[PDB]
From Swiss-Prot:
Effect of residue 293 to A: Cannot complement the growth defect of E.coli cysPUWA-tsuA deletion mutant
Cytoplasmic face residues: 19-36, 88-102, 181-189, 259-269
Keyword Transport part of the UniProt annotation: yes
Protein name as it appears in the record: Thiosulfate transporter TsuA
Gene: tsuA
Catalytic activity: thiosulfate(in) = thiosulfate(out)
Keyword terms, alphabetized: Cell inner membrane, Cell membrane, Membrane, Sulfate transport, Transmembrane, Transmembrane helix, Transport
Transmembrane segments: 3-18, 37-59, 71-87, 103-121, 163-180, 190-211, 240-258, 270-289, 307-326
PANTHER family associated with the record: INNER MEMBRANE PROTEIN YEDE (PTHR30574), SULPHUR TRANSPORT DOMAIN-CONTAINING PROTEIN (PTHR30574:SF1)
Family as reported in the entry's similarity comment: Belongs to the TsuA/YedE (TC 9.B.102) family.
Length: 328
């Protein structure tokens, strides 16, 4: 059953590679290249996931599991994760999926992303994670058809509303925005409309099949890399998230090769390698501290209306802006 992560990861990697999904550049392309493609893709996918997650929970195929709120962890970890993603040339799992494209810089970043996240959870940096955990909010939701017992607070739980209500309100506003302003300049057939539906269906399949394997969450990155390193160095068995990372790399590699876009590549200057390795370390430190990455928090947690995920994605962007100015 854990092997469904390979299939979901495979399909996930295809969607990432064909759409060039890099959420962090959505706010940059709209102001600097007049390209709202990633922005439209982001808001539309979140809206569909808002509706899809609550619908699949209503029919008993899954339960939403919002990540716990930790003000210190979500903010500081999110900010640091934003810094490292710029140094690492990071992306919406681009450190992961561009490994299958043939970018040797991504090979470094992933290694240092995996090591740093491993070190922060259980190694030399775990003293910092242990200190951060003292600020965890005790706010929780109780068991229902919509939520796993003990999950983090959400927009509806705080407001005391059925999760259908803010999901339908915020998604309707998101859909109105994505279609209101008609998108500007891009000729890929894999347009933001078809890519949002595919990405939402993959995220729905991910949430359903992972729950059957015992991991009650949707798509993620950081936990899969830790599970892979743990299995290689401790002989621990792999789980759904570990085989998902394998599938992502495999899926992006297949898509890049079929489209003629695979090529082993090197940066123009070797110092980029040192730059993306510190980025991977910061990404590993920041993602574990914040309790999720651009996938576990932003893509998967925001549609669940999780307060921790919305707060962490705010500082993903602020950390991105900060390091983007430091570098450029
Ligand atoms: C760290 C754990 C990693 C686990 C996952 C690792 C396996 C996934 C790798 C897929 C790369 C696929 C490589 C595809 C190579 C394409 C070659 C090509 O396209 O060559 C064209 C050229 O014209 C010559 O004929
Ligand atoms: C991680 C990169 C994401 C890039 C795509 C963002 C899409 C925004 C929609 C939902 C996000 C929910 C989180 C709320 C915070 C995001 C909005 C924000 O930070 O806006 C700042 C400023 O207005 C900008 O010009
Ligand atoms: C950090 C983990 C990184 C894991 C590694 C990344 C995934 C695999 C990448 C490349 C392998 C493919 C080999 C590339 C060689 C070109 C493809 C090929 O097979 O070419 C044969 C040629 O056509 C005969 O004439
Ligand atoms: C033996 C190995 C020692 C490890 C050596 C490397 C330390 C990196 C670890 C965490 C830094 C993560 C980001 C730190 C953000 C600092 C801002 C802050 O709030 O500091 C709190 C203070 O550290 C609370 O005692
Ligand atoms: C955004 C525009 C397109 C919208 C597309 C989505 C369609 C939504 C239709 C009905 C949802 C609201 C009614 C669904 C039933 C909710 C009430 C309910 O059954 O709750 C039972 C109990 O609370 C737990 O088992
Ligand atoms: C009860 C049903 C519940 C829902 C179940 C859904 C099952 C279908 C899922 C996805 C199909 C849509 C996939 C669309 C793929 C389009 C690929 C594309 O864009 O093709 C470009 C073309 O090949 C360039 O030459
Ligand atoms: C509803 C609950 C789940 C039910 C089961 C739903 C299964 C949906 C899974 C995958 C569909 C999308 C798969 C990815 C298709 C990608 C096609 C593509 O990327 O084509 C680009 C084209 O080549 C131009 O560049
Ligand atoms: C089958 C192993 C083939 C050789 C490994 C390729 C090189 C790995 C080196 C770095 C990648 C770090 C993550 C690699 C993930 C490997 C997962 C693994 O080895 O799992 C063992 C399993 O847990 C036992 O029951
Ligand atoms: C929930 C209020 C109803 C209106 C909703 C409007 C649409 C979404 C706008 C903002 C939500 C984003 C939330 C981002 C995370 C904030 C959580 C937070 O800051 O909590 C501080 C608190 O003091 C810790 O004890």
């Amino acid at each position: 059953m854990i092997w469904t992560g390979l299939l979901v990861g495979f399909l996930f990697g295809i969607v990432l590679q064909r759409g060039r999904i890099c959420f962090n550049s959505a706010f940059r392309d709209v102001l600097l290249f007049k390209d709202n493609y990633l922005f439209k893709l982001a808001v539309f996918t979140l809206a569909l996931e808002m509706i899809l997650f609550v619908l699949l929970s209503q029919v008993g195929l899954m339960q939403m599991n919002p990540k716990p709120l930790n003000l210190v962890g979500n903010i500081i970890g999110g900010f640091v994760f934003g810094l490292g993603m710029v140094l690492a040339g990071g992306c919406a799992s681009g450190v992961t999926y561009r490994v299958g494209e043939g970018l040797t810089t991504a090979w470094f970043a992933a290694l240092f992303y995996g090591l740093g996240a491993y070190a922060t959870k259980s190694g030399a940096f775990s003293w910092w994670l242990s200190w951060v955990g003292q600020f965890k909010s005790p706010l929780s939701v109780e068991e229902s058809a919509y939520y796993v017992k003990g999950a983090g607070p959400t927009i509806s739980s705080v407001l005391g509303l059925n999760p259908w209500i803010p999901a339908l309100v915020i998604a309707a506003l998101f859909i109105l925005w994505a279609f209101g302003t008609k998108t500007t300049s891009r000729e890929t057939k894999f347009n933001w409309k078809i890519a949002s539906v595919c990405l939402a269906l993959v995220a729905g399949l991910g949430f359903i099949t992972s729950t059957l394997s015992g991991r009650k969450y949707g798509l993620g990155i950081t936990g899969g890399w830790i599970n892979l390193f743990q299995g290689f160095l401790t002989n621990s068995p792999l789980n759904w998230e570990g085989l998902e990372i394998v599938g992502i790399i495999l899926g992006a590699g297949v898509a890049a090769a079929v489209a003629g876009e695979f090529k082993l590549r090197m940066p123009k200057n070797p110092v980029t390698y040192l730059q993306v390795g510190i980025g991977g370390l910061l990404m590993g430190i920041g993602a574990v501290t914040a309790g999720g990455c651009n996938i576990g928090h932003f893509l998967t947690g925001v549609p669940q209306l999780a307060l921790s995920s919305w707060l962490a994605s705010i500082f993903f962007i602020l950390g991105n802006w900060t390091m983007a100015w430091i570098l450029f």
